[PDB]
Swiss-Prot record, chains A, B:
Tissues where this protein is expressed: Expressed in germinal center B-cells.
Protein name: C-terminal-binding protein 1
Outcome after substituting G161A: Reduced proteolytic processing mediated by CAPN3
Family to which this protein belongs: Belongs to the D-isomer specific 2-hydroxyacid dehydrogenase family.
Binding site for NAD(+): 75, 155-160, 179, 212-218, 239-241, 265, 290-293
Intrachain disulfide bonds: none
Active site annotation, chain numbering: R241, E270, H290
Self-association state and partner proteins as the record states: Homo- or heterodimer. Heterodimer with CTBP2. Interacts with PRDM16; the interaction represses white adipose tissue (WAT)-specific genes expression. Interacts with GLIS2, FOXP2, HDAC4, HDAC5, HDAC9 and ZNF217. Interacts with ELK3 (via its PXDLS motif). Interacts with RBBP8 (via its PXDLS motif); the interaction is disrupted by binding to adenovirus E1A. Interacts with FOXP1, HIPK2, PNN, NRIP1, MECOM, ZFHX1B and WIZ. Interacts with ZNF366 (via PXDLS motif). Interaction with SATB1 (non-acetylated form); the interaction stabilizes its attachment to DNA and promotes transcription repression. (Microbial infection) Interacts with Epstein-Barr virus EBNA3. Interacts with Epstein-Barr virus EBNA6; this interaction leads to gene repression, but also seems to interfere with the repressive function of CtBP pre-bound to DNA, leading to EBNA6 mediated up-regulation of many cellular genes.
Native source species: Homo sapiens (Human)
Full-sequence portion shown in this chain: 28 to 353 of 440
Region listing for Interaction with GLIS2 2, in residue ranges: 263-328
Keyword set, alphabetical order: ADP-ribosylation, Cytoplasm, Differentiation, Disease variant, Host-virus interaction, Intellectual disability, Isopeptide bond, NAD, Nucleus, Oxidoreductase, Phosphoprotein, Repressor, Transcription, Transcription regulation, Ubl conjugation
Cofactor note: NAD is required for efficient interaction with E1A. Cofactor binding induces a conformation change.
Length: 328, 328
């Protein structure tokens, strides 16, 4: 039978092929949307691999006539209506260990770039700035702050959040976290302080860093209201999902100095541009193009795991044989 | 008597005044060199405070007719001929706890900026780059590498080096160090691996970071010869002293890709400019203007310690009353 497996928003299937060569016909669509996908794929695809760059609504999903499984090459699956997918008989899986430490390292890099102003100092030198005197050094590095004794607030203490917490302690951070879905006790296991409300987290944190999934109940978790609950001159870091932050409220905060700096690897509308959107003329901003996850080893790893999940689905029974189905 | 105390390469003495108000006449010179200092100061100054931006040769020192003590506001004193100073009856002191953790944090920021390419990714976005696909993300973030299992080589395991080592372990770095002046055993105390030669360090290290003082025997420690001993595609970080590196050899290494990236907070000639010198057209480079040390708290702390050292000298006996004399 050699069922059709399609890589939707990509053009390279080299890593996956050795794992699927004997049990699937593999093709790619290099599509940013379903409009771009061929009827043949929509009609015949039994399995699908996708990254974060394409979104599948129920309407998009309904276009697939033979699809039995979607595997996200990555951990986040907010870009798929998994509920409707399941109702349509489509299992959806992810790769949860995808770049856990890469993302945590990127998160720390961002935090350190804010506290040490390293990225901005480099930018200034590129622009031609000459820093001769100690007085000039202090002025150009104005805003740089000592880390020990500072409080880092983590929102979402999952895989990445935990990795971040452990690293943070090594710098002298006092680590707090807010995660309403976790059971009692993790705070004791990892030597952290837990707070029961988002407001508590924001109220006691000098630097806030997001590490929660994007779900039905936390769109614009950071908004006009909750930004006001953040400490004066606080930092914000986001390597989770752009939808978590109202970039309008963040822009205004940065301009008013209510927030001293922000570091974002994800944004409401991606790909990101410094010339398009609310953050266009916002100061004290660091941004990266959703690359917190990336390393060659990580990229290969998650693709290999995703292909194995596809193989388990074809060679076995759905959803019993699946390792990481997130819509049972 | 109220002896004269002069801040040579600065214009602000506000932090120092409350500590010296009753025992010294305090003035500033805002001088980049002795040519800029008034004869009155050269003739009458009994004590001097200075940063890193002015250098005192024996000839410069001979211009001081009443000078009994110099205190470096900072740890490094390579900018003073301390031997000749001592021969001329001039005690020289420093502030050794100056920004230890600030500098270590900056060092980690730099390391993480190289491994995660965060600063360069931001630079690219500022330049207008749009990163839409996963394929584009990999290409633009090409060079980003997983940290766990990587070997960080530390040259100079002093205060900053040790602070860096501890932080590095939290990221999964295998930490090695080379420091020929340390006694047996520190490696066991801190859980590190020690090597006996610089070549060994360079040969086994994916990322090399400098944390040694600049002295008579390590000018251009990194040179055409020793760069060849470094691993292929290795990283280099320097927050110690610019004189430690032959920037000609480093430039050639970066261009040839022998060295994948370098992060420098210090340089052979400071202030640094991307338009002037061997590193002008060198790729994969991060640079900051000797600001690794800076935080408001750190800046105040070291100035307060330096003033207290000045006070101990005036109110007591030299060099017995001194806390941090480095030229007994
Ligand atoms: N930028 C990148 O390249 C990149 C890479 C990996 C992961 N991510 C993102 O980072 C996020 C975290 O990934 P992970 O692997 O740690 O996921 P995870 O499932 O291990 O952790 C998620 C945690 O967030 C918590 N959470 C969910 N909603 C919350 C809310 N409203 N308030 C507080 N806590 C909440 C959950 O209880 C859970 O513990 C994901 O959303 C993922 O999409 C981004
Ligand atoms: N860029 C900045 O803002 C900044 C801030 C603080 C310190 N620094 C610099 O960083 C360096 C380290 O500072 P520190 O406080 O750790 O000093 P430290 O005296 O505590 O440590 C110096 C260590 O380097 C070792 N060393 C000296 N020469 C060596 C060589 N040839 N090979 C190997 N090891 C050698 C010594 O044995 C010593 O253990 C200093 O040179 C200082 O000037 C820079
Ligand atoms: O963003 C995520 O949820 C990830 O797991 C990282 C990622 C990003 C792009 C492709 C694959 C994985
Ligand atoms: O560079 C050093 O040796 C330091 O200790 C940091 C520093 C830099 C500039 C002013 C004061 C201290
Ligand atoms: Ca603050
Ligand atoms: Ca390598």
């Amino acid at each position: 039978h050699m069922p059709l497996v399609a890589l939707l928003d990509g053009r390279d299937c080299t890593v996956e092929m050795p794992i699927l060569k004997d049990v699937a016909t593999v093709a790619f669509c290099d599509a940013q949307s379903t409009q771009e996908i061929h009827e043949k794929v929509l009609n015949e695809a039994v399995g699908a691999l996708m990254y974060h760059t394409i979104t599948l609504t129920r309407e998009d999903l309904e276009k697939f006539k033979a699809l039995r499984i979607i595997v996200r090459i990555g951990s986040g699956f907010d870009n798929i209506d998994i509920k409707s997918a399941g109702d349509l008989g489509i299992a959806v899986c992810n790769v949860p260990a995808a770049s856990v430490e890469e993302t945590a390292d990127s998160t720390l890099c961002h935090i350190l770039n804010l506290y040490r102003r390293a990225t901005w100092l480099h930018q200034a030198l590129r622009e031609g700035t000459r820093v001769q005197s100690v007085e000039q050094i202090r002025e150009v590095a104005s805003g740089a702050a000592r880390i020990r004794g500072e409080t880092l607030g983590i929102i979402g203490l999952g895989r990445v959040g935990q990795a971040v917490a452990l690293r943070a302690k090594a710098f002298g951070f006092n680590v707090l976290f807010y995660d309403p879905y976790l059971s009692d006790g993790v705070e004791r296991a990892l030597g952290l302080q837990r707070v029961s409300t988002l407001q508590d987290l924001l109220f006691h944190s000098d630097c806030v860093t997001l590490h929660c999934g994007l779900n039905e109940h936390n769109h614009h978790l950071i908004n006009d209201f909750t930004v006001k609950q953040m400490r004066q001159g606080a930092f914000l870091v986001n390597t989770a999902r752009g939808g978590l932050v109202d970039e309008k409220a963040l822009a205004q905060a940065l301009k008013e100095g209510r927030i001293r700096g922000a570091a974002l690897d994800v944004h409401e509308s991606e790909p990101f541009s410094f010339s398009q959107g609310p953050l266009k003329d916002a100061p004290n901003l660091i941004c990266t193009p959703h690359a917190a996850w990336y390393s060659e080893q990580a990229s290969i790893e998650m693709r290999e795991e995703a292909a194995r999940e596809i193989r388990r689905a074809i060679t076995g029974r759905i959803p019993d044989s699946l390792k990481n189905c997130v819509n049972k």
